[PDB]
Scaffold this motif. Structure first.
Motif, mmCIF file in Angstrom:
data_model
loop_
_atom_site.group_PDB
_atom_site.id
_atom_site.type_symbol
_atom_site.label_atom_id
_atom_site.label_comp_id
_atom_site.label_asym_id
_atom_site.label_seq_id
_atom_site.Cartn_x
_atom_site.Cartn_y
_atom_site.Cartn_z
ATOM 1 N N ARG A 1 -5.322 -1.947 -8.351
ATOM 2 C CA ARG A 1 -5.393 -1.116 -7.171
ATOM 3 C C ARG A 1 -5.590 0.317 -7.584
ATOM 4 O O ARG A 1 -5.603 1.219 -6.752
ATOM 5 C CB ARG A 1 -4.112 -1.233 -6.296
ATOM 6 N N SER B 1 -9.002 12.406 -10.576
ATOM 7 C CA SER B 1 -8.284 11.912 -9.420
ATOM 8 C C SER B 1 -6.801 12.169 -9.495
ATOM 9 O O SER B 1 -6.165 12.357 -8.462
ATOM 10 C CB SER B 1 -8.473 10.400 -9.166
ATOM 11 N N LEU C 1 -11.103 14.066 -23.147
ATOM 12 C CA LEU C 1 -11.693 13.028 -22.338
ATOM 13 C C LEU C 1 -11.838 13.579 -20.952
ATOM 14 O O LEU C 1 -10.968 14.304 -20.473
ATOM 15 C CB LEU C 1 -10.803 11.757 -22.303
ATOM 16 N N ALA D 1 -21.478 1.462 -13.814
ATOM 17 C CA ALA D 1 -20.161 1.275 -13.253
ATOM 18 C C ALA D 1 -19.136 2.176 -13.889
ATOM 19 O O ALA D 1 -18.017 2.263 -13.383
ATOM 20 C CB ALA D 1 -19.692 -0.178 -13.462
ATOM 21 N N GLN D 2 -19.469 2.874 -14.999
ATOM 22 C CA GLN D 2 -18.492 3.695 -15.681
ATOM 23 C C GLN D 2 -19.273 4.734 -16.437
ATOM 24 O O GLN D 2 -20.371 4.452 -16.898
ATOM 25 C CB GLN D 2 -17.618 2.829 -16.627
ATOM 26 N N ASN E 1 -5.909 13.460 -1.012
ATOM 27 C CA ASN E 1 -7.210 13.616 -1.613
ATOM 28 C C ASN E 1 -7.885 14.727 -0.860
ATOM 29 O O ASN E 1 -7.493 15.054 0.261
ATOM 30 C CB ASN E 1 -8.119 12.363 -1.487
ATOM 31 N N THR F 1 -13.350 11.880 -17.317
ATOM 32 C CA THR F 1 -14.014 10.887 -16.501
ATOM 33 C C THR F 1 -13.656 11.244 -15.075
ATOM 34 O O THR F 1 -12.697 11.988 -14.890
ATOM 35 C CB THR F 1 -13.566 9.449 -16.797
ATOM 36 N N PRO G 1 -16.345 24.128 -1.756
ATOM 37 C CA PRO G 1 -16.981 25.030 -0.748
ATOM 38 C C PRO G 1 -16.942 24.356 0.592
ATOM 39 O O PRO G 1 -16.501 23.213 0.683
ATOM 40 C CB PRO G 1 -18.414 25.209 -1.265
ATOM 41 N N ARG H 1 -10.977 13.464 -4.267
ATOM 42 C CA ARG H 1 -11.414 12.199 -3.728
ATOM 43 C C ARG H 1 -11.767 11.232 -4.823
ATOM 44 O O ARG H 1 -11.141 10.187 -4.942
ATOM 45 C CB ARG H 1 -12.638 12.408 -2.805
ATOM 46 N N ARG I 1 0.838 -1.227 0.000
ATOM 47 C CA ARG I 1 0.000 0.000 0.000
ATOM 48 C C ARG I 1 0.851 1.247 0.000
ATOM 49 O O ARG I 1 2.077 1.183 -0.088
ATOM 50 C CB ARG I 1 -0.980 -0.032 1.201
ATOM 51 N N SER J 1 -15.202 10.645 -5.629
ATOM 52 C CA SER J 1 -16.630 10.780 -5.468
ATOM 53 C C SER J 1 -17.048 12.221 -5.577
ATOM 54 O O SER J 1 -18.151 12.521 -6.029
ATOM 55 C CB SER J 1 -17.082 10.259 -4.083
ATOM 56 N N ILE K 1 -18.737 8.364 -19.174
ATOM 57 C CA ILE K 1 -17.814 9.086 -20.024
ATOM 58 C C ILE K 1 -18.455 10.429 -20.275
ATOM 59 O O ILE K 1 -19.678 10.547 -20.312
ATOM 60 C CB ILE K 1 -17.537 8.358 -21.343
ATOM 61 N N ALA L 1 -12.221 9.427 -12.845
ATOM 62 C CA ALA L 1 -10.926 8.828 -12.628
ATOM 63 C C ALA L 1 -9.788 9.738 -13.018
ATOM 64 O O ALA L 1 -8.795 9.824 -12.307
ATOM 65 C CB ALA L 1 -10.779 7.517 -13.411
ATOM 66 N N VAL M 1 -11.992 16.253 -0.148
ATOM 67 C CA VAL M 1 -13.375 15.845 -0.235
ATOM 68 C C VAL M 1 -14.261 17.004 -0.615
ATOM 69 O O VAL M 1 -15.398 16.786 -1.030
ATOM 70 C CB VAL M 1 -13.899 15.225 1.056
ATOM 71 N N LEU M 2 -13.741 18.251 -0.542
ATOM 72 C CA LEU M 2 -14.439 19.434 -0.989
ATOM 73 C C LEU M 2 -13.381 20.301 -1.620
ATOM 74 O O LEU M 2 -12.188 20.118 -1.389
ATOM 75 C CB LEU M 2 -15.124 20.271 0.133
ATOM 76 N N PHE M 3 -13.825 21.304 -2.419
ATOM 77 C CA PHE M 3 -12.959 22.136 -3.219
ATOM 78 C C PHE M 3 -12.446 23.289 -2.395
ATOM 79 O O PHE M 3 -13.020 23.656 -1.372
ATOM 80 C CB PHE M 3 -13.660 22.763 -4.451
#
Lengths: 75, 68, 141, 64, 191, 46, 59, 70, 145
Positions: E151, A34, A27, A65-66, A6, A29, I1, A40, A1, A42, A68, A31, A8-10
């Motif tokens: 992963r 990230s 493109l 699941a994906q 990451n 997406t 925000p 994050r 690992r 999400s 575009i 991903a 979670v908010l801007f």
RNA sequence: AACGAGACUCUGGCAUGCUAACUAGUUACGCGACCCCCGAGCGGUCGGCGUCCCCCAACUUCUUAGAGGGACAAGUGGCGUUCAGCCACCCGAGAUUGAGCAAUAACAGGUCUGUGAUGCCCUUAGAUGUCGGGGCUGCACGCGCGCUACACUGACUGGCUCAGCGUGUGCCUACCCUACGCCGGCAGGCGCGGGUAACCCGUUGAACCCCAUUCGUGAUGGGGAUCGGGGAUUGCAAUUAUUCCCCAUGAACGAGGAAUUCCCAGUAAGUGCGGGUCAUAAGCUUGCGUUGAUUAAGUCCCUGCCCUUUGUACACACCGCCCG
């Protein structure tokens, strides 16, 4: 690992870049958001839903699941 | 593959051609039905074999003489 | 139209909304503490799951000859992960389905008919095919 | 080596070799010279009439 | 078009095989274009019978591997429809020509094998069938996308379309064009 | 137990339980010194 | 009727089994006629060990 | 879910044919036969393949339980 | 925000504002995921946002709805403890009190000295389980000379 | 000349041919009833959706099970002594779909704890022949068969939609499978009814799969070990927790050394189900469906087996024999 950062908010630079990365990238997406930013993932899902209501991006295909999204469908 | 004919076929095939030479054709189906009437072959699959070899012999007997 | 023609993923998602507008369905108190089946490991995310499931109840009665509280559960049941033990099938809750069907019957969209099972009222059958065309009116079939 | 990529095609298959039958002797025609022919060892399943991609024709087969 | 199926949207016309060596084991458009890649389940009962079935179907078959994914051919076709879609948006081509280059660039030119002498390892260089090249090239690139998404936040669809780009234009950022050159580097040494 | 009558006083804190939880029926266990065939090594003699 | 059981008493050696089977057969002929002449003619003219069951009515 | 799809395709292909075989002439349906059988995929024919019967000493018909020598 | 706050401290365990509300709360012992999706809905708040987006007014209500569950009409069967034993009531136990309660029941079963406390004190499995092939910490055994 | 091989038996694959069916269906109307105009039209009718109605209707394609037919290396092209056969192709179901049965001779193989099969020996009233309790589950350790996992090709929560082999009370001595109604979050309880079974459970309304939310690379919501408290069911009895359920607790484990097993087409792998044992209870075994690949069309290298030739101080047979 490993440890990867990451958010979670801007904050300023992420959000401001988010509006201007769109015409620069064909493109789009969740991903790809990230890696180019530290987001994050999400966060990037719902962030793109917002943009489509403005028409700054275009849907091209969708699934469970994906998903575009593209630049503006121009050429 | 495989399926090399046994001696039980080759024994009776020769016999059936000697004593019923006239009845033979050179078609499979006709030579089958003849073997069914001039003898009883107690299986069905066995019958389909003995006919086919009787046919295959009758091809060669219309050339030079067979030695069996 | 008949309900056969349309998509069924679309059918329920307009039928669930329909009911909740009209003041229909007297709901049980227990609806925020309910696992919903023996083979789940969690409560639903949904906060209006009762409305959604009553849709799927009334639809199946249109197709098949109608059956009781037992059969509805068997239609809904799924796979049970028993952890270290191998998975197996099992049936879910009963007392929820027993409240669903009695709540529908209060509106007279179903009724206990003969031959061991509730069957859907002609008033019910009217209302299904009424909104079945509303689906085609909406998107475009 | 410094030879460019060659192409040569099967004329006939000879038989299988190697110590588990994993190699196949084959005769091949040079596909630019119709009187030239070399024997090769080829690994994969081959039929006849198919073309290979030789990096050299200096090499030549003689045994397993 | 009305007498020959596309792919559900993608032309199999304007598609070429740019080798003379590897055609007649790569084909996709002679009449072998179909709406979907699937079979009734005839694919092999003779050695020659393997060749005939499409390249696009062969790709779908070798995509489902490693236990949990076996016997889930419908899930597999989801990944392939996104692949071509992503390839077309991303670079802009007939996205089959991408794949044909990706297969041809990943197939080895020479290969090694074992030979037993003195109870010690010795190696011998040998050639390779066109049918071997195709089988190998389909194997290698599918291992890449399987490996990357083990992963990564990225989905296998995204990973696979990236892997066909870097194969179709050699750049050694793929698992395939790396591993191709490893074999040939050995084949030079012991020869 | 199997032979032995282990005596116990009854407390008010034991109520609900059974009698048989307060008398054991085996020796707790000690060891040991692994024996011979106690592994893939034990063998041979002549 | 299937019976799938050990072929070895006191199990030892390679593990083997044995499938036995019995095949029953049923078939029925429906008549409608006076019950007298039926019960007269039915019970006679049977050579093998084959069972027969007469029914008063079913339809 | 899957095998049903191939069944409904195989039936409708043959259904169409039979309608022409009975009420229309030969040369109508002979044409239609050449088209379908070109990309044959079990439209006008049927697989003879069904499951084989299991025998003991395996969880499958061919696959066997592990064998230990020590 | 919403840059207002992040990681915080609540009772007895530090809870991050990084994670979603329900799943964040689970870190506190005596509260599982199943126990939290109830208590949030009795509190009538979103579970569709982060724990760092809750205000102080809101989280003050959370602990009250948690620690008096019967009085906010969460059923008795849905609690950790029903008639603890020798305390006479239905109870819900949370982080540092859970451990204290737990250690008592161990002590009790060696007080009476049932089969239970002996198995506890010896460090062997309480429930019906084989220990012949289960365990190991240990395995170095030899016998040769 | 005989036994084994083959032949044989069963099973799968080919029938719009034959035989005949309210304990099996289909079609056709007669329909009348419900439904929506959903399409032409108006709502009727025509068409579409299933159910009741169905017959003194018509039929047997589907389902069922009987009698028969069909595949033979048959035809063609190569190859072979042109013999025995082999390879490719047409037709098409290609000469191998899978099982059952299986010789001579042998083993100091297993079984006296299947046997009211059995020799001899022992024991037989202070019994090796009956009730009560405990044990076969006891652990610093070693090994084997397996099960569940290490996640995003995923988990989680909703929604959609498909199957087969069987089995079932009236039996052993007290016992079956369950629809339906009512009560409970659940385990479960309670009231009624059917089934001797192509008749009732069951048009077996199963899982993986499929469709839409949520989680985000984090030992994480992956994993569910360990462990506390509480509720039910079986039984004469459940403690060393019979089984089942609810809440809480949240470990190893992030793809695995030396080695090694098994497998060639509806096969491997994934996935569920029935039967067996059963008062209560499968991580086992035996069968069955469903989804369904990659790789080979070879060889004697390893391991082993069949036939010939050769060598031998071996025959308790190389796990042999024999020297200082």
């Amino acid at each position: 690992r490993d440890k990867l950062n990451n958010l979670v908010l801007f904050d300023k630079a992420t959000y401001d870049k988010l509006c201007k990365e769109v015409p620069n990238y064909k493109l789009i997406t969740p991903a790809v958001v990230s890696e180019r930013l530290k987001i994050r993932g999400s966060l990037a899902r719902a962030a793109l839903q917002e943009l489509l209501s403005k028409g700054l991006i275009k849907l091209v295909s969708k699934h469970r699941a994906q998903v575009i999204y593209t630049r503006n469908t121009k050429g | 593959m495989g399926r090399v004919r046994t001696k039980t076929v080759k024994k009776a095939a020769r016999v059936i051609i000697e004593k019923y030479y006239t009845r033979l054709g050179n078609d499979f189906h006709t030579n089958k039905r003849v073997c069914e009437e001039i003898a009883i072959i107690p299986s069905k699959k066995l019958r389909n074999k003995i006919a086919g070899y009787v046919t295959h012999l009758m091809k060669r007997i219309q050339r030079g003489p067979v030695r069996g | 139209v008949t309900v056969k023609d349309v998509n069924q993923q679309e059918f329920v998602r307009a039928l669930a909304a329909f009911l909740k507008k009209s003041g229909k369905l007297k709901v049980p108190e227990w609806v925020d503490t309910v696992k919903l089946a023996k083979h789940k490991e969690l409560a639903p995310y949904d906060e209006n799951w009762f409305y959604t499931r009553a849709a799927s109840t009334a639809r199946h009665l249109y197709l098949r000859g109608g059956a009781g509280v037992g059969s509805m559960t068997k239609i809904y049941g799924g796979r049970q992960r028993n952890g270290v033990m191998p998975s197996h099938f099992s049936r879910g809750s009963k007392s929820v389905a027993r409240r669903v069907l009695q709540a529908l019957e209060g509106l007279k969209m179903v009724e206990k008919d003969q031959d061991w099972g509730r069957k859907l009222t002609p008033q019910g059958q009217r209302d299904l095919d009424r909104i079945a065309g509303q689906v085609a009116a909406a998107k475009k079939k | 080596r410094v030879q460019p990529i060659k192409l040569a095609r099967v004329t006939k298959v000879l038989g299988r070799t190697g110590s588990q039958g994993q190699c196949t002797q084959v005769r091949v025609e040079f596909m630019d010279d119709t009187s030239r022919s070399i024997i090769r060892n080829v690994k994969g399943p081959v039929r006849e009439g198919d073309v290979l991609t030789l990096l050299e024709s200096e090499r030549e087969a003689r045994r397993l | 078009t009305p007498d020959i199926k596309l792919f559900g949207k993608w032309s199999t016309d304007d598609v070429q095989i740019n080798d003379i060596s590897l055609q007649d084991y790569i084909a996709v458009k002679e009449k072998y274009a179909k709406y979907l890649p699937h079979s009734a389940g005839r694919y092999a009962a003779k050695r020659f019978r393997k060749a005939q079935c499409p390249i696009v179907e062969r790709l779908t078959n070798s995509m489902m591997m490693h236990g949990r994914n076996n016997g889930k051919k419908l899930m597999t076709v989801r990944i392939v429809k996104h692949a071509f879609e992503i390839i077309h948006l991303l670079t802009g081509e007939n996205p089959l020509q991408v794949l044909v280059n990706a297969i041809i660039n990943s197939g080895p030119r020479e290969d090694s094998t074992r030979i037993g002498r003195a109870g010690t390892v010795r190696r011998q260089a040998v050639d390779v069938s066109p049918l071997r090249r195709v089988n190998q090239a389909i194997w290698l690139l599918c291992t890449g996308a399987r490996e990357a998404a083990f992963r990564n936040i990225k989905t296998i669809a995204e990973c696979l379309a990236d892997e066909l780009i870097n194969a179709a234009k050699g750049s050694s950022n793929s698992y395939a064009i790396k591993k191709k050159d490893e074999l040939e580097r050995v084949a030079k040494s012991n020869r | 137990n199997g032979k032995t009558f282990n005596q116990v006083e009854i407390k008010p804190e034991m109520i609900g339980h059974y009698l048989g939880e307060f008398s054991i029926t085996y020796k707790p266990v000690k060891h040991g010194r692994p024996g011979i065939g106690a592994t893939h090594s034990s063998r041979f003699i002549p | 009727l299937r019976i799938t059981t050990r072929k070895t008493p006191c199990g030892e050696g390679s593990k083997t089994w044995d499938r036995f089977q019995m095949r029953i057969h049923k078939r029925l002929i429906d008549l409608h006629s006076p019950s007298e002449i039926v019960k007269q003619i039915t019970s006679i003219s049977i050579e093998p060990g084959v069972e027969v069951e007469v029914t008063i009515a079913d339809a | 879910h899957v095998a049903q799809i191939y069944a409904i395709r195989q039936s409708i292909s043959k259904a169409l044919v039979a309608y022409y075989q009975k009420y229309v002439d030969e040369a109508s349906k002979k044409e239609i036969k050449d088209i379908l059988i070109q990309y044959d995929r079990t439209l006008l024919v049927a697989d003879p393949r069904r499951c084989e019967s299991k025998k003991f000493g395996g969880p499958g018909a061919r696959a066997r339980y592990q064998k230990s020598y020590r | 925000p919403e840059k207002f706050q992040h990681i915080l401290r609540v009772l007895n365990t530090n809870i991050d504002g990084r994670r979603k509300i329900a799943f964040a709360i689970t870190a506190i012992k005596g509260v599982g995921r199943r126990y939290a999706h109830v208590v949030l809905r009795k509190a009538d708040i979103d579970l569709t946002k982060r724990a760092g987006e809750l205000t102080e007014d809101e989280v003050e209500r959370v602990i009250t709805i948690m620690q008096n569950p019967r009085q906010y009409k969460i059923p008795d069967w849905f609690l950790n403890r029903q008639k603890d034993v020798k305390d006479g009531k239905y109870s819900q136990v949370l982080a540092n009190g859970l451990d204290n309660k737990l250690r008592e029941d161990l002590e009790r079963l060696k007080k009476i000295r049932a089969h239970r406390g002996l198995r506890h004190f010896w460090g062997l499995r309480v429930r019906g389980q084989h220990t012949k092939t289960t365990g190991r910490r240990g395995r170095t055994v030899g016998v040769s000379k």
